[PDB]
Amino acid sequence: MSKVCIIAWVYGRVQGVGFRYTTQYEAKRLGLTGYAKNLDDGSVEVVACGEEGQVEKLMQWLKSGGPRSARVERVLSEPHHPSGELTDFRIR
């Protein structure tokens, strides 16, 4: 037991601006997995495995709101324990 995946739901105007741009590059530095999907209510769901600390390095940008065009209204986080080990990071 080491791997600690987490699910982060981002509210406000996050979908459409292509928020999931640098997510790939950054993810490559950490070597984590997961995916960045979008809800049907205007929100964006981001998931990531590995050590919380390592994951948090790229999440700095999520909680920074890189694209000023976005309107990060709110964001909620929960524990994620998916079955098996994920291959690679991807998108919707």
Short mmCIF file of all heavy atoms in Angstrom, two decimals, residues 7-68:
data_model
loop_
_atom_site.label_atom_id
_atom_site.label_comp_id
_atom_site.label_asym_id
_atom_site.label_seq_id
_atom_site.Cartn_x
_atom_site.Cartn_y
_atom_site.Cartn_z
N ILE A 7 -9.93 12.27 -6.52
CA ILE A 7 -10.82 12.88 -7.51
C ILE A 7 -11.15 14.32 -7.13
O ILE A 7 -11.62 14.56 -6.01
CB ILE A 7 -12.06 11.99 -7.74
CG1 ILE A 7 -12.96 12.61 -8.83
CG2 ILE A 7 -12.87 11.72 -6.47
CD1 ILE A 7 -13.75 11.54 -9.58
N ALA A 8 -10.89 15.26 -8.04
CA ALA A 8 -11.04 16.70 -7.85
C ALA A 8 -12.05 17.27 -8.86
O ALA A 8 -11.77 17.35 -10.05
CB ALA A 8 -9.67 17.37 -8.01
N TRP A 9 -13.23 17.68 -8.36
CA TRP A 9 -14.31 18.28 -9.13
C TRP A 9 -14.18 19.80 -9.12
O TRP A 9 -14.31 20.41 -8.07
CB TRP A 9 -15.64 17.90 -8.49
CG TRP A 9 -16.01 16.46 -8.65
CD1 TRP A 9 -16.44 15.91 -9.81
CD2 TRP A 9 -16.03 15.39 -7.67
NE1 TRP A 9 -16.67 14.56 -9.63
CE2 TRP A 9 -16.44 14.19 -8.33
CE3 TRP A 9 -15.76 15.31 -6.29
CZ2 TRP A 9 -16.56 12.97 -7.65
CZ3 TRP A 9 -15.95 14.11 -5.59
CH2 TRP A 9 -16.32 12.93 -6.26
N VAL A 10 -13.97 20.40 -10.30
CA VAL A 10 -13.79 21.84 -10.46
C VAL A 10 -15.10 22.45 -10.98
O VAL A 10 -15.59 22.07 -12.04
CB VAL A 10 -12.62 22.15 -11.42
CG1 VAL A 10 -12.17 23.59 -11.19
CG2 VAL A 10 -11.40 21.24 -11.23
N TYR A 11 -15.66 23.40 -10.22
CA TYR A 11 -16.86 24.16 -10.56
C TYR A 11 -16.51 25.44 -11.31
O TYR A 11 -15.33 25.80 -11.44
CB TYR A 11 -17.67 24.49 -9.29
CG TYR A 11 -18.25 23.28 -8.58
CD1 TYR A 11 -17.44 22.48 -7.76
CD2 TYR A 11 -19.63 23.00 -8.69
CE1 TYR A 11 -18.00 21.41 -7.05
CE2 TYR A 11 -20.19 21.95 -7.95
CZ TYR A 11 -19.38 21.15 -7.13
OH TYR A 11 -19.92 20.13 -6.40
N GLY A 12 -17.53 26.15 -11.79
CA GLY A 12 -17.37 27.38 -12.54
C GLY A 12 -17.00 27.10 -13.99
O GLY A 12 -17.12 25.98 -14.48
N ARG A 13 -16.57 28.16 -14.69
CA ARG A 13 -16.32 28.12 -16.12
C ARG A 13 -14.93 27.57 -16.43
O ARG A 13 -13.98 28.33 -16.59
CB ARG A 13 -16.49 29.50 -16.74
CG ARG A 13 -17.87 30.07 -16.40
CD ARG A 13 -18.22 31.21 -17.36
NE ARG A 13 -19.66 31.49 -17.34
CZ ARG A 13 -20.61 30.67 -17.84
NH1 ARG A 13 -20.27 29.53 -18.45
NH2 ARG A 13 -21.90 31.00 -17.72
N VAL A 14 -14.84 26.25 -16.51
CA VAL A 14 -13.58 25.53 -16.67
C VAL A 14 -13.58 24.76 -18.00
O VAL A 14 -12.56 24.74 -18.69
CB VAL A 14 -13.34 24.62 -15.46
CG1 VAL A 14 -11.91 24.06 -15.49
CG2 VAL A 14 -13.51 25.38 -14.15
N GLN A 15 -14.70 24.14 -18.37
CA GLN A 15 -14.82 23.47 -19.66
C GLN A 15 -14.95 24.51 -20.78
O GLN A 15 -15.49 25.60 -20.57
CB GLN A 15 -15.98 22.46 -19.66
CG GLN A 15 -17.38 23.05 -19.52
CD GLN A 15 -18.41 21.93 -19.56
OE1 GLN A 15 -19.26 21.89 -20.45
NE2 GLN A 15 -18.31 20.98 -18.62
N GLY A 16 -14.45 24.16 -21.98
CA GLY A 16 -14.57 24.98 -23.18
C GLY A 16 -13.28 25.74 -23.49
O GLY A 16 -12.87 25.77 -24.65
N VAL A 17 -12.63 26.33 -22.48
CA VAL A 17 -11.36 27.04 -22.66
C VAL A 17 -10.21 26.07 -22.98
O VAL A 17 -9.11 26.51 -23.29
CB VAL A 17 -11.08 27.92 -21.42
CG1 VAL A 17 -10.59 27.11 -20.22
CG2 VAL A 17 -10.06 29.04 -21.71
N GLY A 18 -10.45 24.76 -22.89
CA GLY A 18 -9.44 23.74 -23.09
C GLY A 18 -8.46 23.72 -21.93
O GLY A 18 -7.25 23.69 -22.14
N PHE A 19 -8.99 23.74 -20.70
CA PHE A 19 -8.20 23.74 -19.47
C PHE A 19 -7.17 22.61 -19.49
O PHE A 19 -6.03 22.81 -19.10
CB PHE A 19 -9.14 23.60 -18.26
CG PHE A 19 -8.59 24.23 -16.99
CD1 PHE A 19 -8.90 25.57 -16.67
CD2 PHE A 19 -7.72 23.50 -16.15
CE1 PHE A 19 -8.38 26.16 -15.51
CE2 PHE A 19 -7.14 24.12 -15.03
CZ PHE A 19 -7.47 25.45 -14.71
N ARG A 20 -7.58 21.44 -19.99
CA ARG A 20 -6.77 20.23 -20.14
C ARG A 20 -5.71 20.35 -21.25
O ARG A 20 -5.65 19.51 -22.14
CB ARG A 20 -7.73 19.06 -20.41
CG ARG A 20 -8.63 19.33 -21.63
CD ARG A 20 -8.85 18.03 -22.41
NE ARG A 20 -9.57 18.26 -23.67
CZ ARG A 20 -10.90 18.40 -23.80
NH1 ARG A 20 -11.69 18.45 -22.71
NH2 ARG A 20 -11.44 18.48 -25.02
N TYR A 21 -4.85 21.38 -21.18
CA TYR A 21 -3.80 21.63 -22.14
C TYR A 21 -2.46 21.20 -21.54
O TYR A 21 -1.87 20.22 -21.98
CB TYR A 21 -3.82 23.11 -22.55
CG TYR A 21 -3.08 23.42 -23.83
CD1 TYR A 21 -3.67 23.07 -25.06
CD2 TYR A 21 -1.84 24.08 -23.81
CE1 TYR A 21 -3.02 23.38 -26.27
CE2 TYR A 21 -1.19 24.39 -25.01
CZ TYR A 21 -1.78 24.05 -26.24
OH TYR A 21 -1.15 24.36 -27.41
N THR A 22 -1.99 21.94 -20.53
CA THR A 22 -0.72 21.68 -19.88
C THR A 22 -0.77 20.43 -18.98
O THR A 22 0.28 19.84 -18.72
CB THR A 22 -0.21 22.92 -19.14
OG1 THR A 22 1.14 22.71 -18.79
CG2 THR A 22 -1.03 23.24 -17.88
N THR A 23 -1.97 20.02 -18.54
CA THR A 23 -2.20 18.82 -17.74
C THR A 23 -1.36 17.62 -18.23
O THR A 23 -0.81 16.89 -17.41
CB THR A 23 -3.71 18.51 -17.69
OG1 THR A 23 -3.98 17.58 -16.66
CG2 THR A 23 -4.28 17.97 -19.00
N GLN A 24 -1.24 17.45 -19.55
CA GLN A 24 -0.45 16.40 -20.19
C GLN A 24 1.04 16.57 -19.88
O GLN A 24 1.66 15.67 -19.31
CB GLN A 24 -0.69 16.43 -21.71
CG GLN A 24 -2.14 16.09 -22.08
CD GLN A 24 -2.36 14.69 -22.62
OE1 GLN A 24 -1.46 14.05 -23.17
NE2 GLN A 24 -3.59 14.21 -22.49
N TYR A 25 1.62 17.71 -20.28
CA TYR A 25 3.04 18.01 -20.07
C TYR A 25 3.43 17.81 -18.61
O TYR A 25 4.33 17.03 -18.32
CB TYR A 25 3.33 19.45 -20.50
CG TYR A 25 3.33 19.67 -22.00
CD1 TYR A 25 2.22 20.24 -22.64
CD2 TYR A 25 4.47 19.33 -22.75
CE1 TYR A 25 2.27 20.55 -24.01
CE2 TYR A 25 4.52 19.62 -24.13
CZ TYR A 25 3.43 20.24 -24.76
OH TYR A 25 3.49 20.54 -26.08
N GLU A 26 2.74 18.51 -17.71
CA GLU A 26 2.98 18.43 -16.28
C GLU A 26 2.91 16.98 -15.80
O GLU A 26 3.83 16.51 -15.14
CB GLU A 26 1.95 19.31 -15.54
CG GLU A 26 2.63 20.45 -14.77
CD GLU A 26 3.48 21.34 -15.68
OE1 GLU A 26 2.93 21.81 -16.70
OE2 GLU A 26 4.67 21.52 -15.34
N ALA A 27 1.84 16.27 -16.17
CA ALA A 27 1.66 14.86 -15.82
C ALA A 27 2.87 14.01 -16.19
O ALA A 27 3.19 13.07 -15.47
CB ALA A 27 0.40 14.30 -16.48
N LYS A 28 3.55 14.36 -17.29
CA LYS A 28 4.73 13.65 -17.76
C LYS A 28 5.93 13.83 -16.80
O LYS A 28 6.72 12.91 -16.64
CB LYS A 28 5.06 14.08 -19.19
CG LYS A 28 5.88 13.01 -19.92
CD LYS A 28 6.10 13.34 -21.40
CE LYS A 28 5.16 12.53 -22.32
NZ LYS A 28 5.61 12.56 -23.72
N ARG A 29 6.04 15.00 -16.16
CA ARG A 29 7.08 15.29 -15.18
C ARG A 29 6.92 14.42 -13.92
O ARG A 29 7.91 13.92 -13.39
CB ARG A 29 7.07 16.78 -14.80
CG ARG A 29 7.14 17.74 -16.00
CD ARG A 29 8.39 17.51 -16.85
NE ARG A 29 9.01 18.77 -17.28
CZ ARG A 29 9.70 19.59 -16.47
NH1 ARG A 29 9.86 19.30 -15.17
NH2 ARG A 29 10.24 20.72 -16.96
N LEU A 30 5.68 14.24 -13.45
CA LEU A 30 5.38 13.44 -12.27
C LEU A 30 5.31 11.94 -12.60
O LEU A 30 5.62 11.11 -11.74
CB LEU A 30 4.07 13.90 -11.62
CG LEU A 30 4.11 15.27 -10.92
CD1 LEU A 30 5.25 15.37 -9.90
CD2 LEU A 30 4.16 16.47 -11.87
N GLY A 31 4.89 11.60 -13.82
CA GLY A 31 4.72 10.22 -14.26
C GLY A 31 3.47 9.57 -13.68
O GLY A 31 3.38 8.34 -13.63
N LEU A 32 2.50 10.38 -13.24
CA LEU A 32 1.22 9.92 -12.73
C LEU A 32 0.26 9.59 -13.87
O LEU A 32 0.57 9.82 -15.04
CB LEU A 32 0.64 10.93 -11.73
CG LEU A 32 -0.29 12.01 -12.31
CD1 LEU A 32 -0.71 12.95 -11.18
CD2 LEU A 32 0.36 12.83 -13.42
N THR A 33 -0.92 9.05 -13.52
CA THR A 33 -1.90 8.60 -14.49
C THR A 33 -3.18 9.44 -14.31
O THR A 33 -3.13 10.49 -13.68
CB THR A 33 -2.13 7.10 -14.27
OG1 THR A 33 -2.72 6.87 -13.01
CG2 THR A 33 -0.81 6.32 -14.37
N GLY A 34 -4.32 8.96 -14.81
CA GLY A 34 -5.62 9.56 -14.51
C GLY A 34 -6.33 10.04 -15.76
O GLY A 34 -6.07 9.54 -16.85
N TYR A 35 -7.22 11.02 -15.57
CA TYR A 35 -7.85 11.70 -16.69
C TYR A 35 -8.60 12.96 -16.27
O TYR A 35 -8.99 13.10 -15.11
CB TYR A 35 -8.80 10.76 -17.45
CG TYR A 35 -10.00 10.31 -16.63
CD1 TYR A 35 -11.13 11.14 -16.51
CD2 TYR A 35 -9.93 9.11 -15.89
CE1 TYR A 35 -12.16 10.79 -15.62
CE2 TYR A 35 -11.00 8.73 -15.07
CZ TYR A 35 -12.13 9.56 -14.95
OH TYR A 35 -13.19 9.19 -14.17
N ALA A 36 -8.83 13.85 -17.24
CA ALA A 36 -9.55 15.11 -17.07
C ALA A 36 -10.81 15.12 -17.94
O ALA A 36 -10.73 15.45 -19.12
CB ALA A 36 -8.61 16.26 -17.42
N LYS A 37 -11.96 14.74 -17.36
CA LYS A 37 -13.26 14.76 -18.03
C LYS A 37 -14.05 16.01 -17.65
O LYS A 37 -13.62 16.76 -16.79
CB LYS A 37 -14.06 13.48 -17.73
CG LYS A 37 -13.91 12.46 -18.86
CD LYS A 37 -14.49 11.08 -18.50
CE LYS A 37 -14.54 10.16 -19.72
NZ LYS A 37 -15.62 10.52 -20.65
N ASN A 38 -15.17 16.24 -18.34
CA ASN A 38 -16.02 17.41 -18.15
C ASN A 38 -17.46 16.96 -17.90
O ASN A 38 -17.98 16.11 -18.62
CB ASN A 38 -15.94 18.37 -19.35
CG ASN A 38 -14.54 18.81 -19.78
OD1 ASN A 38 -13.51 18.38 -19.26
ND2 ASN A 38 -14.51 19.70 -20.76
N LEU A 39 -18.10 17.54 -16.88
CA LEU A 39 -19.50 17.32 -16.52
C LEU A 39 -20.44 17.96 -17.55
O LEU A 39 -20.01 18.68 -18.45
CB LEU A 39 -19.78 17.89 -15.12
CG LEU A 39 -19.41 16.94 -13.97
CD1 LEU A 39 -19.64 17.63 -12.62
CD2 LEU A 39 -20.26 15.66 -14.03
N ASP A 40 -21.74 17.69 -17.39
CA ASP A 40 -22.81 18.20 -18.23
C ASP A 40 -23.46 19.45 -17.63
O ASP A 40 -24.52 19.86 -18.10
CB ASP A 40 -23.83 17.07 -18.44
CG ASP A 40 -23.22 15.89 -19.18
OD1 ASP A 40 -23.17 15.97 -20.43
OD2 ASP A 40 -22.79 14.94 -18.49
N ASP A 41 -22.82 20.07 -16.62
CA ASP A 41 -23.34 21.24 -15.91
C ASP A 41 -22.38 22.44 -15.99
O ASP A 41 -22.69 23.49 -15.42
CB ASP A 41 -23.60 20.84 -14.45
CG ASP A 41 -24.63 21.74 -13.77
OD1 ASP A 41 -25.79 21.74 -14.25
OD2 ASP A 41 -24.25 22.40 -12.78
N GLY A 42 -21.24 22.29 -16.68
CA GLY A 42 -20.26 23.34 -16.92
C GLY A 42 -18.93 23.14 -16.19
O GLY A 42 -18.06 24.00 -16.26
N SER A 43 -18.77 22.01 -15.49
CA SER A 43 -17.68 21.72 -14.56
C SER A 43 -16.71 20.67 -15.13
O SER A 43 -17.02 20.02 -16.12
CB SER A 43 -18.30 21.28 -13.23
OG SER A 43 -19.62 20.81 -13.38
N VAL A 44 -15.51 20.54 -14.52
CA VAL A 44 -14.43 19.68 -15.00
C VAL A 44 -13.93 18.73 -13.90
O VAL A 44 -13.52 19.19 -12.84
CB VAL A 44 -13.29 20.55 -15.57
CG1 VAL A 44 -12.06 19.73 -15.97
CG2 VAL A 44 -13.79 21.26 -16.84
N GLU A 45 -13.93 17.41 -14.15
CA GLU A 45 -13.52 16.37 -13.22
C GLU A 45 -12.10 15.87 -13.51
O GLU A 45 -11.87 15.28 -14.57
CB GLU A 45 -14.46 15.16 -13.32
CG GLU A 45 -15.94 15.52 -13.45
CD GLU A 45 -16.81 14.32 -13.08
OE1 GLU A 45 -16.46 13.21 -13.53
OE2 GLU A 45 -17.80 14.54 -12.34
N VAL A 46 -11.17 16.07 -12.57
CA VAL A 46 -9.77 15.68 -12.74
C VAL A 46 -9.42 14.56 -11.75
O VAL A 46 -9.76 14.67 -10.58
CB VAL A 46 -8.89 16.91 -12.51
CG1 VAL A 46 -7.40 16.58 -12.71
CG2 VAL A 46 -9.28 18.04 -13.47
N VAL A 47 -8.76 13.49 -12.22
CA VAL A 47 -8.40 12.33 -11.39
C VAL A 47 -6.90 12.01 -11.54
O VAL A 47 -6.38 12.20 -12.63
CB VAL A 47 -9.21 11.09 -11.80
CG1 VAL A 47 -9.20 10.03 -10.69
CG2 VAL A 47 -10.66 11.41 -12.17
N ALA A 48 -6.23 11.55 -10.47
CA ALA A 48 -4.78 11.34 -10.49
C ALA A 48 -4.34 10.35 -9.42
O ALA A 48 -4.79 10.47 -8.28
CB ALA A 48 -4.13 12.69 -10.18
N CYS A 49 -3.43 9.42 -9.76
CA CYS A 49 -2.85 8.42 -8.85
C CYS A 49 -1.43 8.77 -8.43
O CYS A 49 -0.87 9.77 -8.86
CB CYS A 49 -2.90 7.06 -9.55
SG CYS A 49 -4.57 6.36 -9.67
N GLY A 50 -0.84 7.92 -7.57
CA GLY A 50 0.51 8.06 -7.07
C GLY A 50 0.50 8.66 -5.67
O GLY A 50 -0.50 8.58 -4.96
N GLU A 51 1.63 9.26 -5.27
CA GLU A 51 1.80 9.89 -3.97
C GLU A 51 1.16 11.28 -4.00
O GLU A 51 1.47 12.06 -4.89
CB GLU A 51 3.29 10.03 -3.65
CG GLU A 51 3.95 8.66 -3.47
CD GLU A 51 5.44 8.83 -3.18
OE1 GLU A 51 6.15 9.21 -4.14
OE2 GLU A 51 5.82 8.60 -2.02
N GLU A 52 0.29 11.58 -3.03
CA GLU A 52 -0.44 12.83 -2.94
C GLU A 52 0.46 14.04 -3.22
O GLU A 52 0.13 14.88 -4.05
CB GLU A 52 -1.12 12.96 -1.57
CG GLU A 52 -2.60 13.32 -1.73
CD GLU A 52 -3.34 13.45 -0.40
OE1 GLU A 52 -2.66 13.54 0.64
OE2 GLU A 52 -4.59 13.46 -0.46
N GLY A 53 1.62 14.09 -2.55
CA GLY A 53 2.64 15.10 -2.71
C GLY A 53 3.01 15.34 -4.18
O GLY A 53 2.96 16.48 -4.65
N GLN A 54 3.39 14.27 -4.88
CA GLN A 54 3.77 14.28 -6.29
C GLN A 54 2.62 14.80 -7.15
O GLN A 54 2.82 15.67 -7.99
CB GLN A 54 4.14 12.86 -6.74
CG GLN A 54 5.60 12.50 -6.43
CD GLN A 54 6.55 13.04 -7.50
OE1 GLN A 54 7.26 14.02 -7.27
NE2 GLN A 54 6.57 12.40 -8.67
N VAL A 55 1.41 14.27 -6.92
CA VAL A 55 0.21 14.75 -7.59
C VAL A 55 0.02 16.25 -7.37
O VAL A 55 -0.32 16.98 -8.30
CB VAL A 55 -1.02 13.94 -7.14
CG1 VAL A 55 -2.26 14.41 -7.91
CG2 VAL A 55 -0.82 12.44 -7.37
N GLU A 56 0.26 16.73 -6.14
CA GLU A 56 0.01 18.11 -5.76
C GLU A 56 0.89 19.10 -6.54
O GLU A 56 0.48 20.24 -6.74
CB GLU A 56 0.13 18.29 -4.24
CG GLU A 56 -0.95 19.24 -3.73
CD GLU A 56 -0.92 19.36 -2.21
OE1 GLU A 56 0.17 19.69 -1.69
OE2 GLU A 56 -1.98 19.13 -1.60
N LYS A 57 2.07 18.67 -6.99
CA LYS A 57 2.99 19.48 -7.77
C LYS A 57 2.30 20.05 -9.01
O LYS A 57 2.40 21.26 -9.26
CB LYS A 57 4.22 18.67 -8.19
CG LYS A 57 4.94 17.92 -7.05
CD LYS A 57 5.53 18.80 -5.95
CE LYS A 57 6.60 19.74 -6.51
NZ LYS A 57 7.52 20.19 -5.45
N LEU A 58 1.60 19.22 -9.79
CA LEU A 58 0.88 19.69 -10.96
C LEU A 58 -0.43 20.38 -10.57
O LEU A 58 -0.87 21.28 -11.28
CB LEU A 58 0.65 18.57 -12.00
CG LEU A 58 -0.57 17.66 -11.76
CD1 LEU A 58 -1.81 18.14 -12.53
CD2 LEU A 58 -0.23 16.25 -12.25
N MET A 59 -1.04 19.97 -9.46
CA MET A 59 -2.30 20.55 -9.01
C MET A 59 -2.12 22.01 -8.60
O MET A 59 -3.10 22.76 -8.63
CB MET A 59 -2.96 19.73 -7.90
CG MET A 59 -3.18 18.27 -8.30
SD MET A 59 -4.91 17.73 -8.45
CE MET A 59 -5.23 17.27 -6.72
N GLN A 60 -0.89 22.45 -8.27
CA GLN A 60 -0.59 23.86 -8.10
C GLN A 60 -1.22 24.67 -9.24
O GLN A 60 -1.91 25.66 -8.96
CB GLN A 60 0.93 24.08 -8.00
CG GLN A 60 1.49 23.43 -6.72
CD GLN A 60 2.58 24.26 -6.05
OE1 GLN A 60 2.40 25.45 -5.81
NE2 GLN A 60 3.72 23.64 -5.73
N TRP A 61 -1.07 24.22 -10.50
CA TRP A 61 -1.61 24.98 -11.61
C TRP A 61 -3.15 24.99 -11.60
O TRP A 61 -3.74 26.04 -11.86
CB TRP A 61 -1.03 24.37 -12.91
CG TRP A 61 -1.87 24.57 -14.13
CD1 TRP A 61 -2.05 25.72 -14.82
CD2 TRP A 61 -2.73 23.59 -14.75
NE1 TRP A 61 -2.97 25.51 -15.82
CE2 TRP A 61 -3.43 24.21 -15.81
CE3 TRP A 61 -2.98 22.23 -14.49
CZ2 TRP A 61 -4.36 23.51 -16.59
CZ3 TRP A 61 -3.89 21.51 -15.29
CH2 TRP A 61 -4.58 22.15 -16.34
N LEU A 62 -3.79 23.85 -11.30
CA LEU A 62 -5.25 23.76 -11.17
C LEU A 62 -5.77 24.79 -10.17
O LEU A 62 -6.65 25.59 -10.51
CB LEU A 62 -5.69 22.33 -10.77
CG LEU A 62 -5.77 21.39 -11.98
CD1 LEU A 62 -5.46 19.94 -11.61
CD2 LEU A 62 -7.18 21.43 -12.60
N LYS A 63 -5.21 24.81 -8.95
CA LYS A 63 -5.59 25.77 -7.91
C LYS A 63 -5.03 27.18 -8.15
O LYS A 63 -5.35 28.08 -7.38
CB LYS A 63 -5.20 25.22 -6.52
CG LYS A 63 -6.09 24.05 -6.07
CD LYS A 63 -5.38 22.69 -6.11
CE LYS A 63 -4.30 22.54 -5.03
NZ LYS A 63 -4.78 21.76 -3.87
N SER A 64 -4.23 27.40 -9.22
CA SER A 64 -3.73 28.72 -9.60
C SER A 64 -4.65 29.36 -10.65
O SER A 64 -4.75 30.59 -10.69
CB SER A 64 -2.29 28.60 -10.10
OG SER A 64 -1.79 29.86 -10.52
N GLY A 65 -5.31 28.56 -11.49
CA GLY A 65 -6.18 29.08 -12.53
C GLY A 65 -5.37 29.74 -13.64
O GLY A 65 -5.50 30.94 -13.87
N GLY A 66 -4.52 28.95 -14.30
CA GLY A 66 -3.66 29.38 -15.40
C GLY A 66 -4.39 30.25 -16.43
O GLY A 66 -4.06 31.43 -16.57
N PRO A 67 -5.38 29.70 -17.16
CA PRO A 67 -6.15 30.45 -18.14
C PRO A 67 -7.12 31.41 -17.44
O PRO A 67 -8.16 30.97 -16.94
CB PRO A 67 -6.86 29.40 -19.00
CG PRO A 67 -7.02 28.22 -18.04
CD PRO A 67 -5.77 28.30 -17.16
N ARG A 68 -6.80 32.70 -17.43
CA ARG A 68 -7.62 33.78 -16.87
C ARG A 68 -9.04 33.83 -17.46
O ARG A 68 -9.95 34.34 -16.81
CB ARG A 68 -6.91 35.13 -17.06
CG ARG A 68 -6.55 35.42 -18.53
CD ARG A 68 -5.97 36.82 -18.70
NE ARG A 68 -7.01 37.83 -18.99
CZ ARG A 68 -6.74 39.09 -19.36
NH1 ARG A 68 -5.48 39.55 -19.34
NH2 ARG A 68 -7.73 39.90 -19.75
#
